Amino acid sequence: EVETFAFQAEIAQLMSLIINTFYSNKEIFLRELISNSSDALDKIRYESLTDPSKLDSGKELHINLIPNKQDRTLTIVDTGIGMTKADLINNLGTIAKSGTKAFMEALQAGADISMIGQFGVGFYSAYLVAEKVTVITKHNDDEQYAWESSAGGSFTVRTDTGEPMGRGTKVILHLKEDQTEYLEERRIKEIVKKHSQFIGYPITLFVEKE
Numbered sequence: 101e102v103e104t105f106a107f108q109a110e111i112a113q114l115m116s117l118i119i120n121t122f123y124s125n126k127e128i129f130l131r132e133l134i135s136n137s138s139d140a141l142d143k144i145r146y147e148s149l150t151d152p153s154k155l156d157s158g159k160e161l162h163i164n165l166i167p168n169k170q171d172r173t174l175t176i177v178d179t180g181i182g183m184t185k186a187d188l189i190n191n192l193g194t195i196a197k198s199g200t201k202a203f204m205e206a207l208q209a210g211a212d213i214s215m216i217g218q219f220g221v222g223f224y225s226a227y228l229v230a231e232k233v234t235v236i237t238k239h240n241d242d243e244q245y246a247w248e249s250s251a252g253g254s255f256t257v258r259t260d261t262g263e264p265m266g267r268g269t270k271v272i273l274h275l276k277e278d279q280t281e282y283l284e285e286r287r288i289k290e291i292v293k294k295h296s297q298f299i300g301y302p303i304t305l306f307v308e309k310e
C-alpha cells in the first residue's frame with residue numbers, strides 16, 4: 101500500500117520557489133546532499149561508540165555517487181543512520197518548517213539560494229536539477245521505505261520491496277532534460293573537488309558501461 105501525504109504549506113512554498121526561481125549556480129545541490137550524507141554517517145558513528153551492535157547492519161561508512169545516463173538519474177548512496185518512517189514524514193529528519201521561515205527571511209536580508217544548507221533544508225536544493233526525487237532508506241529500528249515526490253504539493257511513502265540496503269539512504273535524482281551535465285564524470289569530479297574536498301568519508305564515483 102502507498103500512503104499519500106500533503107506537504108506542510110511552508111515546504112510547498114519553499115519547493116515552488118526553488119523550482120521557479122532563475123538561479124544559474126545549480127551545482128550546489130550536490131554539495132548539500134553530500135553534506136547531509138556526511139551528517140548521517142557521523143550520527144551512526146557516534147551511536148556506535150557506546151553500542152557497537154549498531155554497526156551489525158554494515159560496518160563500512162562511505163558515500164557512493166552513481167550516474168546512469170540511460171535512466172537519466174544520479175544516485176547518492178550513504179551507509180549512514182537512515183530514516184524511520186516518522187523521520188520521512190517529518191520532512192526527512194529536518195526542522196523544515198522553522199528552517200524554511202528563517203531561510204526566506206534571509207533571502208530578503210541579502211542572502212542567496214546557495215546558503216540554503218545553513219537553514220537545515222539543503223535537501224530541497226535537489227529540485228534545482230530534478231523533476232522527481234526518490235529516497236530509499238533503512239534505519240536499524242524500522243523497515244525499508246521509499247519516499248517520492250515530483251513536487252506539486254504531495255509526497256508518497258511505501259514499504260520498499262527492492263534490493264535490501266542493510267542501513268542507510270539512497271537519494272535518486274530524476275534529472276530534468278536540460279540538466280544532464282550532472283551525469284558527466286568530469287563535471288561531477290569538478291563539483292566534488294570544489295565543494296566537498298574535506299568530507300571525512302570516502303566518496304566513490306561509479307563509472308558507466310557504454
Ligand SMILES: Nc1ncnc2[nH]cnc12
Nearest residue numbers: 136137140182192193269
Ligand atoms: N542522507 C540522509 N540521511 C539521513 N537523513 C536524511 N535526511 C535527508 N537526507 C538524509
